[PDB]
Amino acid sequence: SVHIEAKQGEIAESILLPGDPLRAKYIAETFLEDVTCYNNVRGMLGFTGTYKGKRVSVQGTGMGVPSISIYVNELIQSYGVKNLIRVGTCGAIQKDVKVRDVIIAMTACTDSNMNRLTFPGFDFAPAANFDLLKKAYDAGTEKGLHVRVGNVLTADVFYRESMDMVKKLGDYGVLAVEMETTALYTLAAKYGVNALSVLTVSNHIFTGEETTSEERQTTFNEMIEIALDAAIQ
Amino acid sequence: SVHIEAKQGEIAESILLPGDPLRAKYIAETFLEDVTCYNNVRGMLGFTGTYKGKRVSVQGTGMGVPSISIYVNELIQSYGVKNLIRVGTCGAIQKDVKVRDVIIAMTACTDSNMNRLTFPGFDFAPAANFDLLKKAYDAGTEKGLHVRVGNVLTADVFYRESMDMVKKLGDYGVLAVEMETTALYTLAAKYGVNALSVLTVSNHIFTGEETTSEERQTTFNEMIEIALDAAIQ
Amino acid sequence: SVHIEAKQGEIAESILLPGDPLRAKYIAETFLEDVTCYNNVRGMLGFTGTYKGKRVSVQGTGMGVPSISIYVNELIQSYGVKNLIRVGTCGAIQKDVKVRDVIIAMTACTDSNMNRLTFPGFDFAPAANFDLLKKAYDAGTEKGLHVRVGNVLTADVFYRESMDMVKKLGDYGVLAVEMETTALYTLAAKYGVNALSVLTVSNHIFTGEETTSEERQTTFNEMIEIALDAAIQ
Amino acid sequence: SVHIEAKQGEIAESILLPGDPLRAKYIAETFLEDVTCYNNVRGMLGFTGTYKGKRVSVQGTGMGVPSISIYVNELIQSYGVKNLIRVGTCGAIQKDVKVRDVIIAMTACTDSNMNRLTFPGFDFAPAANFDLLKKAYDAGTEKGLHVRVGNVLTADVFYRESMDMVKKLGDYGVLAVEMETTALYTLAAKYGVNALSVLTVSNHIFTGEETTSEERQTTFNEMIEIALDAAIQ
Amino acid sequence: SVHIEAKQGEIAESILLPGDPLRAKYIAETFLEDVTCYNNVRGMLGFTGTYKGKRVSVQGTGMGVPSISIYVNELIQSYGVKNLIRVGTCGAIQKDVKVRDVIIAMTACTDSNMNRLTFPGFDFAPAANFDLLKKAYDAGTEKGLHVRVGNVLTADVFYRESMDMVKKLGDYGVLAVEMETTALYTLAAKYGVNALSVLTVSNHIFTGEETTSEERQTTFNEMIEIALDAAIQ
Amino acid sequence: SVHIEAKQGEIAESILLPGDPLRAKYIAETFLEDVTCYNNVRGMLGFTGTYKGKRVSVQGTGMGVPSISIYVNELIQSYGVKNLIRVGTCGAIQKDVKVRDVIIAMTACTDSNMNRLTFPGFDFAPAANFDLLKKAYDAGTEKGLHVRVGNVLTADVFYRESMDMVKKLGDYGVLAVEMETTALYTLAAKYGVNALSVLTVSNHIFTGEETTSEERQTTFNEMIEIALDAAIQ
Ligand SMILES: O=c1[nH]cnc2c1ncn2[C@@H]1O[C@H](CO)[C@@H](O)[C@H]1O
Ligand SMILES: O=c1[nH]cnc2c1ncn2[C@@H]1O[C@H](CO)[C@@H](O)[C@H]1O
Ligand SMILES: O=c1[nH]cnc2c1ncn2[C@@H]1O[C@H](CO)[C@@H](O)[C@H]1O
Ligand SMILES: O=c1[nH]cnc2c1ncn2[C@@H]1O[C@H](CO)[C@@H](O)[C@H]1O
Ligand SMILES: O=c1[nH]cnc2c1ncn2[C@@H]1O[C@H](CO)[C@@H](O)[C@H]1O
Ligand SMILES: O=c1[nH]cnc2c1ncn2[C@@H]1O[C@H](CO)[C@@H](O)[C@H]1O
After folding, report:
1. Three-class SS of residue B170?
2. Residue F84 CA to chain centroid, in angstroms?
3. How far, in Å, is the centroid of ligand 3 from the Cα of C63?
4. Single Gene Ontology BP term (chains A, B, C, D, E, F)?
5. Contact A157/F114 with Cβ under 8 angstroms?
6. What value does the CA radius of gyration of chain C take, rounded to a whole number of Å?
7. Ligand (nearest to CA of C155)
8. Crossing angle of helices E217-232/E130-143, nearest 10°?
């Protein structure tokens, strides 16, 4: 496809979608066997390998609705992918949400115009595939993680001048901010395939608490495991 | 409160919310013991009774976002209600969704302006309480119902001149149309309480299939049972 | 029709539209002769009778744009109704407007999306039928009421978190808030029939003054009389 | 003021507002006695004189919401004007509306953003002063004109690429298109003064019928008379 | 055309567009030879003459997007005009912008709805013809003027209740406010012809500094010269 | 900063901004001397080196408004960058625009919501720094390139279901589609620094013509040269 140099059949039907291509590399090296790298266009690494015997892929998406939309469209339309699980990080916008929690997004709010253009006059609420959601929830519960299932904000702006609306969304139960889920969930629904986002809380936007990769790695490793499990089912 | 004549403490913390007040009467008479009627203002019947030993209420809401918003605000703010389960009907907008299916709404799309006013420039995706959702899903699964968990449209207009956008929403996986869920889910989130909508598919909007109350009553009875169960937990 | 169980011909061509079905009952019992009840679906009472010798009907609408839109569509499209007069209550948003005033709405502002969906990019100003308006004005003037003719707000939300915009509308001459007129006037215009809203001011939103039904009943009775008069002409 | 060179007190409290400054000149010369010209800034002629003994003014506004808004703000805020009557022309968008009809605008629809900016999320329906409206209606009725009272479109674009929405507005009872009323009515309401628009239908937009000034002059003269009458009361 | 009484061929292919028709008269009398007046409809003077031997026209537009849109549509579509240069005034909204500066608009922001209607869901950025822009820039540079090339605001409202957004636009580099450029640039682009706006700063909106025509006339004369030069090339 | 691991002072005040980090590597290796790599976070390579003796940097941005906004905010606010030139590719949406043309964006249209959120009710037209624009134009003219200066579309969606609006924008003179310029120009203006986008046309969206990197490399090399030149001045 335009942004992926893989041949037909090189990408598995189940795929993990980190935003960072170097995290795709880490996931492939850490968890998968019999690994090939099928893409390095724009440095946006993608790999296929085996986990507990099943083929699976892992593909960086880049940051933001427009970037992930490019990759998700191509994966679905050109490579026949069926199950797509974003594995990422997010910033908590509730005191009750803690750094190192794992959030499974039921749905996402957004300040993107992508869906207002598609459905003029409507608020489109992009939804997770429930069967994948339940599988990940059950796997994370059994893995012993603090799993929260709820709403997130998919933001176009990482650096927002006023935080008033983000605070207000938090007061309406929105758990955390990230930059991709609306697009993944909307496009998967469009094409009749299955999507989920599973996120590690890496910082709290209003307390200023933050972590490096190393400082959240055990939780992050465990989260990848339950994303892979929800994939291989 | 302005629209409910009950005294403080007459309404239980868990409540079922049919749109039709005569369905509230049917539910109270059919399922509950030790029943009182606490409201007849505007004919919008409300009852409290016991089911398998636990107090519970049932309150008509009327039709549409503005009507249910009035009742939900008053129930939460004046009567201290904690768990709110809409029990209603809907029209399928997918061929794969069948009349007599039970839909549990994860989230809702809308053509209402209610949330655009509250969050200018954003698409707010109103979400179910996951713990209530899981309890209802498990109860309906065990009850032997065809349960579908997904997205619905909360419409302001029952009679829409063009169906183009409703068809398009169906192509993006939206299961059915109804007229209340956005408001229930948004207000419950605002106030930190727990909401869910559990709906019986009564007609298919694009095939013209339809049912009377009697023609869907066994399914509807079973749905009330699993809404009550998710309530008494 | 879907929400009205009347046979063809049971509903008169001229109809009064209170929001409260129990007010429809009161109006029929108090003012009409030879009364039949033609509907009790959803408890949304409707009656036909005679006033000073002419057939007329009275039909509850419920609260809010979506509810009244259902009834008005069915009345016009399935029952051939020609003259529709909402008879209701409202909350004043001007100090100069007094409780027990009667407001005849020339037009209505709204926070509903109903017309933005129909006319993308435009502000649709829903207008009263002038001939009905003049007849009601003349009848109320002769009846000795304080009649104010002007603009109202048709609100989707009864409980608004911030009142800033309602105050601002008051500063631009908007007289009172209610929850139905935009829909009645828009739909009547769509179908080429005649509509009017005639409202009793029951409270002042910024002074906190309020009334019970009994405390405004003489004014309310007189208002029904001039709505009926504007109907029988 | 910035756009009017008159001294304080040179402009009467009642004023007619044609769009064309040469029509202001015609009105002053044809109907008024003891006439002064108080403005020629930008060629936007304004005059004060006497009609049946009462002082009155007549001021061109130019075409479009932004132009008339400039003049109306200055007249109200700098010159203390109290009663403002636009006297203009319009294009019919209904077959039932005829060239040479006089339309008295109850309210106006618009494709302008002026009110969406002022009232975010709301549709503001700009309304005529009813007392002035009734006075003009009664005067036109007695004068023997075909007077229509209803809704108009205030357009930003005279040359619209697609007429679909103008046709649709006609199907919802909107009588004619012009380019000023929304602004006049909104600003008068803002400042607590009295406004009305009284328009001669000069063309039918969908039949192509049209008139020159001379071809509608008797009707136009009669309309000025009843605008002046509604002014001097 | 509807608003211009000229015969075919009476208007030159290159035209200057002041807002004030009396400025069109001043420009023709001051700079042109062999002058004819081809229009006085609505007092909106238009002239054709010769400058340094080349035919050119000058046409008042009136104030605001709707007024200039009428004239620009007719000039382009009925009179075959090819090069259109608005010559006007503006109010500075930056301290760094000085009264008597000449601004050449690259593009324009707006609070008009004109382009949102044409391109639903998009922000259309109306752009100058670069070749004309460069010619005017070079001519003004050589003439010894303080020329600033940048962004302006095309406003619908001259009298804005809150200046917050105008201040904010200034903080994003917008130089000045005027009332026509969006429309000129958009329509010229639509029809494949060449437009530019060249403006004299006449006042500073936040310091209150202001000028009369006489007080900026030398600069204004020099600006007309470089607009004419960019025209005759 | 959060997404760039460079120390203070490692990034030059003038910077080129390709979307593809591997193009940043190519630019540094091909054109610069004394090169350091200061960033590999997320694989988003950034380099500093010397060109004709002046320090300069080159930093990948990723694809889309949200991605480039992250990098541009950090470069400006944390690293003190002053001159930012996007060097990228685009798809032509005019027949008159040819593959291998170089477009210098004066301004950009968008379907992003980023500026509607910042300036509610307004169309913000993001503008290039004119001084940088002129320097690049002059350099490209002297280099012998086909340089077009005009408007572009900054799109959120690479894969758009309907092309109707893109075609319409082309009919209004918009030259090409890309995915970053609105954000670069808006943020540079916010912070008072200088930005430009210089793009090679790599494909024609409506003819299907396309190129590989190798097939446009001579033009692309020449474009980098004139972006660097406009930088070192
Ligand atoms: O606090 C946050 N705000 C926005 N995005 C975040 C946050 N935390 C993690 N991400 C995620 O990391 C990238 C941006 O750095 C995006 O991919 C986003 O989804
Ligand atoms: O097909 C449908 N469209 C809209 N609402 C429906 C449909 N089916 C059931 N409801 C539900 O019944 C009432 C309206 O009659 C509303 O309360 C709505 O939620
Ligand atoms: O102050 C008010 N706000 C909103 N609606 C009102 C008010 N007063 C009367 N109504 C009317 O009563 C119902 C809501 O209780 C609605 O039908 C509305 O039209
Ligand atoms: O058909 C019409 N469309 C738009 N405006 C019209 C029409 N007829 C009359 N006017 C009026 O004349 C000026 C424009 O020529 C505007 O002032 C408008 O109000
Ligand atoms: O400060 C200003 N605000 C708005 N428009 C201005 C300003 N200065 C000059 N103009 C210009 O003059 C007319 C309005 O008086 C308009 O044509 C506008 O473009
Ligand atoms: O035809 C096009 N549409 C959208 N973006 C394009 C096109 N051609 C080049 N780009 C540019 O390349 C990346 C997307 O592949 C984006 O960075 C965009 O700016």
Report:
1. helix
2. 8
3. 8
4. purine nucleoside catabolic process
5. yes
6. 17
7. 3
8. 130
The residue range of the domain holding D35 is 1-233
**Cα–Cα distance for residue pair C64/B67, rounded to 1 Å:** 6
Contact D187, D70 (CB under 8 A): no
Chains that touch A (3 or more CB pairs under 8 A): B, C, E, F
CA of B130 to the centre of ligand 2 (A): 24
Considering only CA atoms, which of B131, B88, B133 is closest in space to residue B107? B133
Cβ–Cβ gap F70/A159 under 8 Å: yes
SS (H, E, C) chain C: CCCCCCCCCCCCCEEEECCCHHHHHHHHHHHCEEEEEEECHHHCCEEEEEECCEEEEEECCCCCHHHHHHHHHHHHHHHCCCEEEEEEEEEECCCCCCCCCEEEEEEEEECCCHHHHHCCCCECCCECCHHHHHHHHHHHHHHCCCEEEEEEEECCCCCCCCCHHHHHHHHCCCCEEECCHHHHHHHHHHHCCEEEEEEEEEEECCCCCECCCHHHHHHHHHHHHHHHHHHHC
Q: Is D123 on the interface with E (CB under 8 A)?
A: no
> If we measure between CA atoms, which residue out of B99, B39, B126 comes closest to residue B219?
B99
C-alpha pair distances (Å), C169 with each of A118, C110, C182, D189, E140: 32, 10, 16, 10, 48
| C176 in contact with chain D, both atoms CB, cutoff 8 A | no
Q: C66 and B183 in contact (C-beta within 8 Å)?
A: no
Report d(CA C122, CA C125) in Å as an integer: 9
Tally Cβ neighbours within 10 Å of residue A23: 22
Sign of CA dihedral A76, A80, A81, A82: positive
Q: Give the bridge partners for E151, in sequence order.
A: E107
Are F77 and F11 in contact by the 8 Å Cβ rule? The answer is: no
The residue to which tokens 């032997």 are assigned = B144
Determination technique used: X-ray
Give, using CA atoms, the residue closest to atom 4 of ligand 2: B178
- Beta strand F14-17 with C176-178 is unpaired
Is any ligand 5 atom within 6 A of the Cβ of residue E154? Answer: no
Quick check: E198 and E226 in contact, CB under 8 A? Answer: yes
CATH of the domain at C12: 3.40.50.1580
Q: Are F66 and F112 in contact (CB under 8 A)?
A: no
Contacts with B121 from chain F: Cβ below 8 Å: 113, 116-117, 120
DSSP 3-state of A223: helix
| Residues with Cβ within 8 Å of residue E9, at least 6 apart in sequence | none
Q: Identify the CA nearest to E197 among candidates E110, E126, E117.
A: E126
Residue F64 C-alpha to ligand 6 middle, in angstroms? 9
* B150 DSSP β-pair partners: B105
Q: For an interface test with D, which of C103, C112, C116, C172 has the most D Cβ atoms less than 10 Å from its Cβ?
A: C172
The residue with tokens 């055990």 is: A218
The residue type found at F141 is: T
HSE-CB for B232 with a 13 A CA cutoff:
16
The alpha-helical segments, DSSP class H, found in chain F are 21-31, 65-79, 114-118, 130-143, 164-171, 181-191, 217-232
Residue recorded with tokens 């007080």: E215
Alpha-helical segments (H) within F33-124: 65-79, 114-118
For residue D83 the two structure tokens come to: 């009663």
Helix (H) or strand (E) holding F87: strand F83-92
Contact D199, D89 (CB under 8 A): yes
DSSP F158-224: SS-S--HHHHHHHHTT--EEESSHHHHHHHHHHHT-EEEEEEEEEEETTT--B--TGGGHHHHHHHH
Alpha-carbon distance of A102 to A105, in angstroms, equals 10
Enumerate residues 6+ apart whose C-beta is below 8 A from E148.
E97, E101, E102, E103, E104, E175
**Closest alpha carbon within chain B to F112:** B121
Query: What is the number of structural domains in chain D?
Result: 1
AA letter at E8? Q
